[PDB]
Amino acid sequence: QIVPDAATCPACLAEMNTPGERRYRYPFINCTHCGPRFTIIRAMPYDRPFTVMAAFPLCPACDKEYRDPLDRRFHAQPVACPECGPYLEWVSHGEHAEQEAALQAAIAQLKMGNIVAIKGIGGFHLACDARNSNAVATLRARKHRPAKPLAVMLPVADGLPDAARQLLTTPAAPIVLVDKKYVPELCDDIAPGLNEVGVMLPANPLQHLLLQELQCPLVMTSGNLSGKPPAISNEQALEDLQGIADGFLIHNRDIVQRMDDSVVRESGEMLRRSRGYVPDALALPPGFKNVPPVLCLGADLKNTFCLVRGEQVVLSQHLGDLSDDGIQTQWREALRLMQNIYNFTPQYVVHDAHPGYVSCQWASEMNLPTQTVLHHHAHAAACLAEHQWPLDGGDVIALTLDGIGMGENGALWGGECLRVNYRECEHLGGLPAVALPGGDLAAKQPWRNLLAQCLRFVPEWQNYPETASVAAANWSVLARAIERGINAPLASSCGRLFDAVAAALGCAPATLSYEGEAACALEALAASCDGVTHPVTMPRVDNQLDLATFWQQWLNWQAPVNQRAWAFHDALAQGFAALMREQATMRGITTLVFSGGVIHNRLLRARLAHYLADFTLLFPQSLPAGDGGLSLGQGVIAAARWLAGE
Ligand SMILES: Nc1ncnc2c1ncn2[C@@H]1O[C@H](COP(=O)(O)OP(=O)(O)NP(=O)(O)O)[C@@H](O)[C@H]1O
Ligand SMILES: Nc1ncnc2c1ncn2[C@@H]1O[C@H](COP(=O)(O)OP(=O)(O)O)[C@@H](O)[C@H]1O
Ligand SMILES: [Mg+2]
Ligand SMILES: [Zn+2]
Ligand SMILES: [Zn+2]
Ligand SMILES: [Zn+2]
């Protein structure tokens, strides 16, 4: 059995720490109870000639340890000392060094405020001093990342809430998101515009060394240009990162699988599922048995694939966006290793119903029978699967809220009420479909969504201060294209409605640098309000929300901006609750399901749960609510269809 890659045990820490010990300050110390698992395997089974440790035979003194039944190093396939093992290597613009000299080289570079590349378990990290403004602004520049929040590694978990200290210290050692008030030492460029900071603890022996001598918080971000795959080779780090890193702290141990840090909320909610959780299987729900091997390709962004067989499913690591170049290489390598570990050969492939997805291209190359699942049906079934809803459990009403996914018959959906079970998805209602002006540009420029909402729903909209930067431009050319349907497809998107509201409040840059940026901003603004009495509503008209009444009330309710943002969240939840109540009660349904990337918004769930207390409510928890949980939803729908004999 291979278990997930795991955080250094207290025991290995104690040995690396004790003077005169053979592995004192050795940065590759591992044992039978911690260390790289999944990341160091070239093939099955889990024995040293088929790990990366074949470049290192074991010296005489690491032969009574590995061979020893009493030792906590009995069949640690990667275990080595400084005599026989990998050793650190420092590389700089006309410098070089090795071992202890290399570790000190990096420490000194970090201390002087520089960016260093450090080889971790699952890839490389870029690090600097997280207190040092100059250094953060520069890392942002070089990595191209102008706003997306940086995770930060802390020496200890002192001063954090109990719930976070608990998660931070698990063998998985994820990044945990916590209120930024708890970490005053961070410069303001770490998570600008947001209320949460992602923190982590040292989880690998090198990280423990670095932090023990640095005793300050460090940025720890992925070793790559934004929207390019993490370099995994020393060779590729040194090439890809030359203009970013001031220095390289590398090593001659190969990494064989890309494995990003996992990200959870202090609440326990899973956001990104990789290091520490993969490659654990999950049990399929009651009634799911004897399922043939099916490969589920997942979503185009935040991608994971899934392998379904028998009574279990296994999700891959976060692979990211599949429109990136070199992501297919890492994808296929992860699939190769996962199929080899599970002796898995697919007989079927399942993929998204969207014909323009990269994933749907790869499927047709496979020579297996293929089938299609609606994006929003997959989101909803993924949530039902996590809650172990039985195969014959009965219909639910689902609310699936996201940016965009392809719906029935070509429609663009992202804010829908559905009747679902594992085989069927019937669309019932939701947000009105509104144009995306300039197609792909609508997700980058929130003001385009505000314009589209105003043209549809707001009389004399040019007279509101909220619309002033749009009204001052020559907006009629784009309005003429909208009316003619030129690159302005209709979408009932919850994510785009969030962007319209954020444009109206001015809480985001006019043009965004990352996906979901305006919505995270608006949520951060609203979360600073403790709740407010307000008159803004989103009433139900038949099976849709009445956005004209929404805009007229919301635009005319002057209040501090945090209260305006809170009112929007509240009125949105109240209107969807009203819709789901009518649909579920008149069908005899007592369970409601919530899914889609928007359902990561904590204030939205809090308000939905406040207004839907008359129902049983199923929210995602152990898998991401967004696209990273999508392959699992595809796999349970495929399975249930087969189990029914269709
Ligand atoms: N305050 C925060 N709020 C939400 N998410 C956070 C926060 N801090 C860190 N994270 C997550 O930590 C992750 C690390 O890097 P990410 O930067 O997306 O992928 P990468 O492959 O490592 N590099 P890149 O491709 O540029 O993104 C991102 O998912 C962040 O969203
Ligand atoms: N806190 C939030 N509040 C509202 N919307 C959000 C929030 N976080 C993310 N989103 C939205 O959800 C989208 C991600 O949803 P997901 O289902 O993962 O992907 P997609 O929309 O690409 O199918 C983001 O682009 C953004 O539109
Ligand atoms: Mg503190
Ligand atoms: Zn150990
Ligand atoms: Zn040795
Ligand atoms: Zn989605």
Side-chain angles (χ1 to χ4, degrees):
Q1 304 296 127
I2 206 54
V3 291
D5 291 291
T8 314
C9 54
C12 276
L13 182 43
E15 209 216 288
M16 190 189 55
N17 277 356
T18 283
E21 261 278 300
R22 207 170 103 288
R23 301 190 187 89
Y24 170 66
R25 299 186 53 91
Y26 196 45
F28 297 90
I29 181 161
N30 68 284
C31 89
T32 245
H33 253 71
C34 79
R37 296 288 172 273
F38 186 79
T39 46
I40 53 93
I41 308 153
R42 313 185 142 279
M44 276 297 94
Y46 187 40
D47 177 48
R48 210 204 183 82
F50 308 105
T51 98
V52 72
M53 306 290 69
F56 311 93
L58 293 185
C59 79
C62 303
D63 228 57
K64 55 182 147 35
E65 315 179 305
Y66 178 90
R67 264 164 181 67
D68 212 65
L70 206 79
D71 219 328
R72 184 199 67 256
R73 295 172 215 102
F74 182 70
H75 292 56
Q77 307 295 339
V79 70
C81 66
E83 258 41 290
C84 68
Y87 57 87
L88 321 37
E89 170 156 63
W90 169 254
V91 168
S92 211
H93 311 129
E95 297 289 41
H96 190 280
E98 276 148 347
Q99 306 191 36
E100 192 54 56
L103 164 72
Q104 290 301 123
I107 275 152
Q109 285 268 50
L110 281 172
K111 277 190 170 140
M112 69 173 59
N114 284 300
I115 299 157
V116 8
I118 300 164
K119 206 163 149 184
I121 264 152
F124 283 80
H125 287 89
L126 288 153
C128 66
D129 187 356
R131 302 170 302 159
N132 189 335
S133 276
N134 298 327
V136 174
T138 311
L139 171 59
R140 285 208 174 279
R142 296 196 186 155
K143 201 179 152 159
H144 287 38
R145 190 185 182 108
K148 202 173 164 127
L150 292 172
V152 153
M153 179 163 280
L154 299 190
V156 289
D158 286 19
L160 300 169
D162 306 342
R165 305 214 297 294
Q166 161 66 51
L167 293 155
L168 283 159
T169 53
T170 51
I175 303 173
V176 175
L177 304 185
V178 305
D179 190 311
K180 70 165 38 161
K181 70 174 179 185
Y182 297 116
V183 205
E185 266 187 352
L186 304 188
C187 62
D188 32 78
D189 244 37
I190 290 312
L194 271 19
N195 296 146
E196 301 191 287
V197 170
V199 302
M200 65 200 301
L201 295 170
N204 88 46
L206 177 51
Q207 292 172 347
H208 269 109
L209 296 172
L210 293 150
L211 270 302
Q212 274 158 215
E213 205 168 338
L214 279 163
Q215 292 315 292
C216 70
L218 303 168
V219 171
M220 214 67 79
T221 188
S222 212
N224 45 90
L225 271 20
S226 281
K228 251 207 135 187
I232 40 182
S233 67
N234 304 162
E235 214 269 65
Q236 203 43 75
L238 307 163
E239 172 100 348
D240 192 23
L241 296 158
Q242 69 182 296
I244 301 193
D246 294 316
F248 298 75
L249 185 57
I250 53 191
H251 72 245
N252 53 1
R253 191 182 66 191
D254 300 332
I255 299 165
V256 82
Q257 286 294 319
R258 170 217 178 150
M259 194 61 70
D260 293 6
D261 312 316
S262 296
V263 188
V264 312
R265 284 208 250 253
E266 165 187 321
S267 99
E269 169 193 6
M270 171 71 62
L271 278 51
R272 195 134 105 166
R273 190 186 170 276
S274 279
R275 181 170 61 73
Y277 308 111
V278 176
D280 287 354
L282 310 167
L284 288 172
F288 285 77
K289 53 183 140 141
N290 177 230
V291 179
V294 179
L295 163 67
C296 308
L297 299 178
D300 265 22
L301 292 301
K302 305 187 220 62
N303 183 269
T304 59
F305 60 80
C306 111
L307 312 164
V308 183
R309 191 180 50 190
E311 83 154 72
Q312 293 177 108
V313 58
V314 53
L315 280 171
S316 73
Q317 67 276 36
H318 166 84
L319 280 348
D321 155 350
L322 304 180
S323 88
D324 272 0
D325 293 286
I327 183 53
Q328 170 193 116
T329 306
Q330 266 159 198
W331 197 88
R332 179 188 304 283
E333 297 302 336
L335 182 48
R336 184 184 67 79
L337 188 66
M338 206 70 95
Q339 295 183 324
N340 182 242
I341 285 172
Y342 288 92
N343 252 138
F344 188 100
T345 303
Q347 283 163 210
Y348 299 93
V349 75
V350 183
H351 57 279
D352 191 272
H354 198 317
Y357 275 12
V358 173
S359 56
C360 302
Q361 184 48 52
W362 310 346
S364 87
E365 298 175 7
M366 273 160 193
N367 195 46
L368 287 172
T370 54
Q371 65 190 274
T372 261
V373 170
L374 288 174
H375 195 82
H376 293 94
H377 188 190
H379 280 310
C383 182
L384 291 174
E386 194 201 302
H387 286 274
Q388 306 283 336
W389 190 251
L391 187 65
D392 51 327
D395 295 349
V396 306
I397 302 303
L399 178 72
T400 52
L401 299 186
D402 70 353
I404 280 114
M406 159 83 81
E408 267 154 21
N409 298 313
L412 299 181
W413 291 349
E416 315 312 312
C417 189
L418 314 172
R419 178 183 62 88
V420 318
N421 53 50
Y422 295 114
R423 294 154 60 191
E424 279 172 286
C425 183
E426 174 190 9
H427 184 272
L428 308 180
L431 292 179
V434 175
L436 297 168
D440 287 345
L441 292 175
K444 312 175 176 200
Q445 306 184 319
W447 69 265
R448 289 166 175 278
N449 309 288
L450 183 62
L451 177 65
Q453 288 285 333
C454 285
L455 290 172
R456 287 284 299 277
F457 304 122
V458 191
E460 285 192 306
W461 62 266
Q462 294 149 86
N463 309 343
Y464 288 95
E466 293 88 348
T467 62
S469 66
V470 170
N474 189 23
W475 54 267
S476 75
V477 187
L478 181 61
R480 277 190 288 140
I482 295 164
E483 270 286 49
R484 289 163 61 180
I486 300 162
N487 193 208
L490 300 186
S492 36
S493 179
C494 204
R496 299 295 78 84
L497 172 59
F498 268 80
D499 291 356
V501 174
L505 284 179
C507 64
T511 303
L512 302 181
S513 69
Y514 72 92
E515 65 183 330
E517 179 171 7
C520 291
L522 185 66
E523 184 183 348
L525 194 56
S528 76
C529 167
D530 256 10
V532 70
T533 304
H534 67 266
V536 182
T537 68
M538 251 187 232
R540 187 171 16 105
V541 163
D542 299 334
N543 62 326
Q544 293 217 142
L545 295 192
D546 180 356
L547 293 188
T549 293
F550 167 71
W551 285 115
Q552 179 212 274
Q553 294 165 341
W554 184 87
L555 292 169
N556 291 287
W557 185 66
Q558 286 74 30
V561 290
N562 60 341
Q563 279 175 37
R564 300 189 77 179
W566 193 95
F568 164 65
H569 285 76
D570 192 41
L572 185 73
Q574 195 287 328
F576 278 126
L579 221 85
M580 294 181 86
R581 178 171 292 110
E582 172 71 30
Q583 296 295 333
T585 305
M586 299 312 299
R587 287 178 173 78
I589 284 170
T590 61
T591 301
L592 300 183
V593 166
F594 300 83
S595 204
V598 172
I599 288 284
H600 281 133
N601 182 315
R602 295 190 295 176
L603 172 53
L604 195 52
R605 292 181 249 120
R607 307 305 298 161
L608 293 157
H610 167 69
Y611 295 117
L612 294 165
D614 47 336
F615 290 87
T616 302
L617 308 188
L618 296 186
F619 292 96
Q621 170 79 2
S622 19
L623 315 157
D627 284 8
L630 192 82
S631 60
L632 189 259
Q634 299 171 332
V636 293
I637 302 166
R641 280 166 180 182
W642 180 85
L643 283 158
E646 312 176 358

